[PDB]
Design a protein around this ligand. Structure first.
Ligand SMILES: [Mg+2]
Ligand SMILES: [Zn+2]
Ligand SMILES: [Zn+2]
Lengths: 184, 391, 56, 49, 140, 42, 32, 69, 147, 262, 115
RNA sequence: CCUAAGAGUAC
């Protein structure tokens, strides 16, 4: 996201507002008659920008807009966050959860895990068994493994509906008990 | 198979499933889990090889390792936690369960021990039933910290003539430790009796734990409100001390420790402050945990877990380090593009003040990922180098 | 190193391991198929003629 | 749901793994160890597209 | 069979400790000023409060008849007569230490299945206790 | 399949997770073996 | 919502991400 | 693939409650929880059996049959 | 394996009557050891089990996205509003005897993957078989009946 | 005289009752028998003639094996293992036939109402698939695109849940005792207060709450078990309970018979 | 592959019987009875009913391995009382109690109108 | 059959 001065509010703010979000929602709903509003529309109107590491060296990024853009009884259950005590941002992260890859986006609550466990799951979900393609019945692959009853996870992430994980799940919801039952 | 105990002679038991099955206590010398480990089996083809395999490489003969003149096999995992829970002073067993537990010991002599309590209800203590497994004539006496001949805390261990006089049975007694029960039994009665002891203890404790139950959950990682407030206060105080040290260094008033530069001394002080902050918060959390806490029970038994695990899950994950240092400035003078230049605050260089229960902020998540990556790389390099050195 | 110090051998099995609290310390559980594959040669003796004949 | 981005060579689906390399036409300066006589080396991997 | 020791004590302190069913009590003899007792009691099965008078008897057996454990314990049949009928709370344990506290005071340590007891007093009446098994009988 | 189609390999500390990797490659997705850190995912 | 120039929330960014994946896809780099 | 006949854990028959569930979701605009409670799925084993099912068979039916009579 | 690096093989399989059961008759599909939790510090596993329990009871879907403001306390409050113990513990009874277990069991739905490593594709034994043509030693690999 | 039963709720598929004046072992054995040892009818063998659908043959065979069938008169059927026929006959099996064709442009749903009994039931009350929903269509067995066909035959034998869970008629069985924890058979995990953090069971209304000052009753045993039996549909739930008791009694009687005969 | 047939859980194999009784030398007047193709369902019930008896000094059972459906039950009674007689009395009491329970349940169910 | 390459399991 691009952050500009926004002299009307007297403080730094994202260039994207509720109108653009509404237009994007309208376009998505129409896809599922008004003027189309795609990602290229955001790109061409200076709403979002493409930044690589070299350019990322010379910018200041806000992690989330709602907590870092506006200037300054808290829930003890919530994790501790800081405001960075600085207002000179040039860009804003679209979402922090987008730092993860395809395999790590399946992990539920990856921030509550020890990092090697996340690495293990990333390497191990590629070996998970499910439905790799819907046309597996007309493909002569050397080896194929299909679940009888794939189930979409009860605990799901927002990023896994762009990976079609709810359409082609690779696991099942089993009733698990954590117990030293029999020693086996 | 890095050592001779990783290659031992067993007795075949033909079973109707597609996996090798082995006792839990023998997994330690093999360094074997059941998360997909495969193992190999070789069959001798002559009477000479068969005989020398049974008389030299047999599992009971390997119980005491020459590697450190102490037993290499012990009570582990569920049996250790169960044996700690069973020998508590609160544990009393009624007649029916006592009979079932006595029958489960294969070499039980057939006499029911007189109950520890006769009136108004016959009750057997857990120590009384466990002493049936211990062979007759074994004497053991270990004095823990602060224990007397009377045991107000029930710590230490006194076993007289194969009867547990007092002490909670835990890792220091039935684990693979020098001077423990395994060592004494194998040096007094022989390897065969020690293997029989392994079997009897496992059977009785596993039966009792099956009919008592043991679990762990998210609530075991939760400390109450006042403890969380004290932990947050401790973290804030440590961060304030770090800020004061930073002010002193930035005013050049800080003096360099002899043998290191100014920056190295400052980093050393900051790391020490953050480390002791994490330790103090973890100790607060551990003290707050009740005796019914399941993670606390596993730690006390020694079966699994440690103080640092409780600290990181409940109080504070701590300072993430790469190459023995705080998170370096990968970008120009900053760790991430979300911090300003020349920011030496604990959050800017990889201090995770949130526990795993609370969850990590994105920057803390990335720093923890860097630490875990360093750990994995070190593991791979270490296993390769150790293999070469061993050869 | 590949054929003299260490070599592939016959009469060997390999498979996944599982825990069993009901097995003795010196016991190992062997799948029935593996036990049916691996064999031991027993010399025919007056002391074991009957059971060897039965196994045959 | 198939996303494409792969070739079919002799009936087998082949994917080209993205190969990482150092960028060209960038000047990089590196220190050198004590035994070497040269202390610092500035190099450019010049290449024309 | 006979009562090796018998006295009346007053409880001065009850310590729950980390337990929910067992409490450690300290008691002072109400007749001899040199005799004191420390004892773990299953309070769930026999409640004990502070300033409570308990008659305590240590015996070598429970049968009324004289002695003619090594014999397996059997459930008490109906109509069986034993010393325990006259008391409320009975434990069985072994003596594991005879300590010389002073010139006249000695202490005897008993372990009833892990419940510990220490009885201290002058040897003139604690001499009957010896290194063997014993029954502890308590009535309120 | 998706992870394979977005995979990068580095011919051969280069194995470490660098700071500049933020938002460009997955912080925790890499083989445990000899390719730890060398093989990355977008 | 009613105001056209009101600032967005953390929930609104998922709409932007949806648009991105509606145009790019998951294997956009290979095809491009 | 297609709705399981029975709940895995307890064994309650749920293979006849899929079309009713879809009808409740679509025609009556009921949320998932109320629709599950209406069909008689009170234990969360059955609720996860019906709630998390993915009806992939529709996709399979889209392709033309290999052996058409 | 779960989605948190908690791999493991099936030790044994019990029928329904032998598994521990809650007061509602629910028996687990899987039982995993507590000792896998403390050392590995997979708190996300427990949080996801709790969230999945709440989602199954309420009919909604659990939002387990990483950096959201979803806390254990809120999930526990929802679970308590559903009439269960807030921390996911349930009183369970032993299958063999029907007696209550002295310890309450952490119980709930969790997402598991079946991995490609099955025992039937790995079991292998060789008494005598084909030999290498050059060294006259057993061939390599279970696909070739090797040694 | 003996065990006493009082039933709270009676339904077509559920019975909720109280089992008083009985040992814990007896109640648990009854529960286990109801779970496992009750004979029932279910499809056991599937001969597939034609399958042009999108599902595998053994997939459909498994689904058919999980279809609940009427088993009211299952005691009149014999086990296939102890019948004199070769593979299956009328004295020990019921033969059904599923023949479906996709002659409609829209998807055609193959339910369990299309299962047709072929073998002569000889007047028994077995074989009919159990229909529960109001629409009348049974379990959704398969789906057919236009032109797809599914022809197969099923043989159903009697069986118990021990051999395979598809023969279990008992679903979930609620089983509770001592709602107030007066016997102290559990130690309640808690953070601040055990009473506040553990919700009271619905059965707590049927027992007197403890006085909180009385001493622990060490002589008290366990009785008055609150049990709720659910029925899949193969047999009525009351018949589930009665046949569970009958099967347990048969097991004990067989033990006596073996003891006497040896 | 190596998985045993499920009917082996309850069907007696060839050449084996339901019960076998062996005297116990550890204690006087004690027997060990091996029940084949049985499990906790019968073992717990028999053990509890035996413990209800007044002349039974010891009664316990154990399933030595979950793989195999069999269990061992040790019974020791007072002098002059046959352990087999104790087993007979326990089985008879169980049968009587179950019959009474079945009768009571039938009578209670006959009183319903909303079934 | 050999060779090479790649992916992966447990350390
Ligand atoms: Mg392992
Ligand atoms: Zn269910
Ligand atoms: Zn027939």
């Amino acid at each position: 996201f691009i952050v500009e001065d926004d002299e009307s509010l007297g403080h730094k703010e994202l260039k994207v507002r509720k109108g653009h979000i509404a237009k994007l929602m309208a376009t998505e709903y129409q896809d599922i008659d008004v003027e189309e509003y795609t990602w290229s529309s955001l790109l061409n109107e200076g709403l979002v920008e493409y930044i690589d590491a070299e350019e990322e060296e010379s910018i200041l990024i806000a992690m989330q807009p709602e907590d870092l853009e506006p200037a300054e009884d808290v829930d003890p259950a919530k994790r501790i966050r800081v405001s960075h005590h600085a207002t000179t941002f040039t860009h804003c992260e679209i979402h922090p959860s987008m730092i993860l890859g395809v395999a790590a986006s399946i992990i539920p609550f990856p921030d509550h895990n020890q990092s090697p466990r996340n690495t293990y799951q990333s390497a191990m979900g590629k070996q998970a068994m499910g439905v790799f393609l819907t046309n597996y019945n007309v493909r002569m692959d050397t080896m194929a493994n299909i679940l009888y009853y794939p189930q979409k996870p009860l605990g799901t992430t927002r990023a896994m509906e762009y990976l079609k994980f709810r359409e082609l799940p690779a696991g099942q919801n089993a009733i698990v008990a954590i117990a030293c039952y029999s020693g086996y | 198979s890095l050592h001779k105990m990783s290659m031992m002679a067993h007795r075949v038991k033909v079973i109707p499933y597609s996996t090798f099955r082995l006792n839990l206590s023998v997994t330690s010398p093999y360094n074997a889990d059941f998360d997909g480990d495969e193992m190999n089996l070789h069959v001798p083809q002559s009477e000479e090889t068969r005989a020398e395999l049974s008389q030299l490489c047999a599992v009971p003969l390997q119980i005491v390792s020459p590697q450190s003149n102490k037993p290499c096999m012990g009570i582990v995992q569920d049996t250790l936690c169960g044996i700690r829970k069973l020998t508590l002073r609160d544990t009393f067993i009624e007649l029916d369960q006592v009979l079932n537990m006595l029958y489960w010991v294969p070499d039980w002599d057939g006499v029911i021990p007189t109950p520890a309590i006769i009136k108004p209800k016959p009750l057997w203590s857990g120590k009384q039933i466990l002493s049936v497994a211990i062979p007759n004539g074994i004497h053991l006496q270990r004095f823990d910290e602060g224990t007397t001949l009377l045991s107000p805390k029930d710590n230490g261990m006194l076993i007289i003539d194969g009867q547990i006089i007092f002490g909670v049975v835990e890792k220091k007694t039935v684990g693979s430790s020098n001077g423990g029960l395994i060592h004494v039994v194998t040096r007094e009665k022989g390897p065969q009796v020690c293997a029989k002891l392994f079997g009897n203890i496992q059977k009785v404790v596993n039966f009792w734990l099956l009919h008592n139950g043991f679990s762990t959950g998210i609530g075991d990682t939760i400390a109450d409100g006042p403890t969380m407030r004290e932990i947050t206060e401790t973290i804030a105080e440590a961060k304030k001390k770090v800020l004061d040290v930073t002010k002193e260094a930035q005013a050049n008033l800080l003096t360099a420790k002899h043998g290191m530069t100014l920056r190295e001394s400052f980093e050393d002080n900051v790391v020490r402050f953050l480390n002791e902050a994490r330790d103090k918060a973890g100790r607060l959390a551990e003290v707050n945990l009740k005796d019914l806490n399941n993670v606390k029970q596993m730690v006390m038994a020694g079966s699994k877990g440690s103080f640092i695990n409780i600290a990181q899950m409940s109080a504070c994950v701590g300072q993430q380090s790469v190459e023995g240092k705080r998170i370096a400035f990968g970008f120009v003078d900053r760790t991430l593009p979300h911090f300003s230049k020349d920011d030496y605050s604990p959050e800017s260089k990889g201090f995770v003040e949130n526990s795993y229960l609370r969850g990590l902020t994105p920057q803390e998540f990335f720093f923890h990922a860097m630490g875990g990556r360093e750990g994995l790389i070190d593991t791979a390099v270490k296993t390769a180098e150790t293999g070469y050195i061993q050869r | 190193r590949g054929n003299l110090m260490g070599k592939r051998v016959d009469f060997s099995a390999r498979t996944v391991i599982s825990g069993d609290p009901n097995l003795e310390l010196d016991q190992v559980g062997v799948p029935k198929s593996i036990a049916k594959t691996l064999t031991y040669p027993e010399v025919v003796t007056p002391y074991n003629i009957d059971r060897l004949t039965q196994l045959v | 749901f198939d996303m494409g981005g792969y070739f079919i060579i002799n009936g087998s689906e082949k994917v080209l793994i993205a190969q990482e390399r150092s960028a060209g036409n960038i000047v990089q300066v590196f220190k050198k160890a004590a035994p070497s006589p040269i202390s610092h080396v500035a190099e450019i991997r010049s290449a024309l597209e | 069979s006979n009562t090796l020791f018998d006295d009346i004590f007053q409880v001065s302190e009850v310590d729950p400790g980390r337990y929910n069913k067992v409490c450690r009590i300290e008691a002072a003899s109400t007749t001899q000023d040199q005799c004191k007792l420390t004892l773990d009691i299953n309070v769930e099965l026999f409640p004990v409060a502070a300033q409570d008078s308990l008659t305590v008897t240590i015996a070598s057996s429970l049968n009324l008849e004289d002695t003619p454990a090594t014999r397996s314990w059997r459930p008490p049949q109906a109509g069986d007569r034993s010393l325990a009928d006259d008391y409320d709370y009975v434990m069985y344990g072994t003596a594991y230490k005879f300590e010389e506290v002073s010139k006249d005071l000695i202490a005897v340590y008993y372990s009833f299945g892990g419940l510990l007891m220490r009885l201290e007093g002058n040897y003139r009446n604690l001499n009957n206790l010896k290194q063997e098994n014993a029954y502890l009988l308590i009535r309120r | 399949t998706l992870s394979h189609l977005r995979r990068t390999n580095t011919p051969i500390k280069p194995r470490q997770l660098h700071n500049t990797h933020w938002g460009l490659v997955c912080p925790a997705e890499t083989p445990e073996g000899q390719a730890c850190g060398l093989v990355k995912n977008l | 919502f009613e105001d056209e120039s009101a600032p967005i929330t953390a929930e609104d960014s998922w709409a932007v991400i949806s648009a991105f994946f509606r145009e790019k896809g998951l294997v956009s780099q290979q095809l491009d | 693939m297609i709705v399981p006949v029975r709940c895995f854990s307890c064994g309650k028959v749920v293979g006849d409650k899929w079309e009713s569930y879809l009808n409740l979701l679509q025609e009556d605009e009921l949320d998932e929880g109320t629709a599950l409670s209406r069909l008689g799925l009170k234990r969360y084993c059955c609720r996860r059996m019906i709630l998390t099912h993915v009806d992939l068979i529709e996709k399979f039916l889209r392709y033309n049959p290999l052996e058409k009579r | 394996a779960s989605r948190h690096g908690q791999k493991g093989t099936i030790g044994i399989t019990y029928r329904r009557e032998d598994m521990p059961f809650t007061a509602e008759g629910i028996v687990p599909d899987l039982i995993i050891n507590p000792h896998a939790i403390p050392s590995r510090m997979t708190v996300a596993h427990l949080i996801e089990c709790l969230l999945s329990k709440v989602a199954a009871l309420s009919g909604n879907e659990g939002d387990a996205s990483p950096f959201t403001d979803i806390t254990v306390e809120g999930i526990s409050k929802l679970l308590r509003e559903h009439g269960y113990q807030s921390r996911g513990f349930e009183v369970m009874y032993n299958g063999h005897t029907g007696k209550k277990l002295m310890a309450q069991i952490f119980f709930g739905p969790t997402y598991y993957q079946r991995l490609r490593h099955m025992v039937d594709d790995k079991i292998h034994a060789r008494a005598r078989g084909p030999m290498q043509v050059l060294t006259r030693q057993p061939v390599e690999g279970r696909s070739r009946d090797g040694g | 005289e003996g065990p006493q039963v009082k039933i709270r709720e009676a339904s077509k598929d559920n019975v909720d009752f109280i089992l008083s004046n009985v040992d814990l072992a007896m109640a648990n054995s009854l529960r286990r028998v109801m779970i496992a040892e009750i004979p029932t009818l279910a499809i056991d063998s599937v001969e597939v003639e034609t399958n042009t659908t999108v599902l595998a043959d053994e997939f459909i065979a498994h689904r058919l094996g999980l279809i609940p069938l009427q088993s009211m008169d299952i005691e009149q059927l014999e086990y296939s293992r102890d019948c004199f026929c070769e593979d299956h006959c009328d004295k020990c099996s019921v033969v059904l036939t599923l023949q479906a064709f996709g002659e409609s442009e829209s998807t055609t749903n193959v339910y369990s109402k299309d299962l047709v009994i072929v073998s002569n039931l000889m007047g028994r009350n077995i074989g009919h698939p159990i229909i529960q929903d109001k629409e009348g269509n049974g379990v959704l067995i398969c789906k057919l695109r236009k032109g797809q066909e599914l022809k197969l035959t099923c043989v159903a034998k009697k069986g118990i849940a021990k051999e395979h869970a598809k023969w279990g008629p008992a679903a979930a069985i609620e089983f509770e005792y001592d709602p107030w924890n007066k016997l102290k058979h559990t130690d309640y995990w808690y953070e601040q207060d055990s009473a506040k953090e553990w919700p009271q069971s619905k059965n707590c209304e049927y027992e007197d709450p403890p006085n909180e000052g009385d001493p622990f009753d060490y002589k008290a045993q366990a009785d008055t078990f609150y049990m709720n039996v659910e029925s899949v549909g193969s047999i009525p739930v009351d018949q589930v309970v009665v046949r569970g008791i009958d099967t347990l009694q048969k097991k004990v009687a067989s033990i006596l018979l073996a003891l006497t005969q040896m | 592959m190596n998985a045993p047939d499920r009917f082996e859980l309850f069907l007696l194999g060839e050449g084996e019987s339901k019960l076998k009784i062996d005297p116990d030398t550890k204690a006087p007047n004690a027997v060990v009875i091996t029940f084949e193709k049985e499990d906790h369902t019968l073992g717990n019930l028999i053990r509890a009913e035996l413990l209800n008896d007044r002349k039974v000094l010891f009664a316990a059972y154990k399933v030595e391995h979950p793989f195999f459906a069999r269990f061992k039950l040790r019974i020791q009674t007072t002098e002059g009382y046959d352990p087999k007689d104790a087993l007979k009395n326990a089985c008879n009491s169980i049968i009587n109690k179950l019959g009474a329970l079945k009768t009571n349940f039938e009578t209670e169910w006959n009183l319903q109108t909303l079934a």
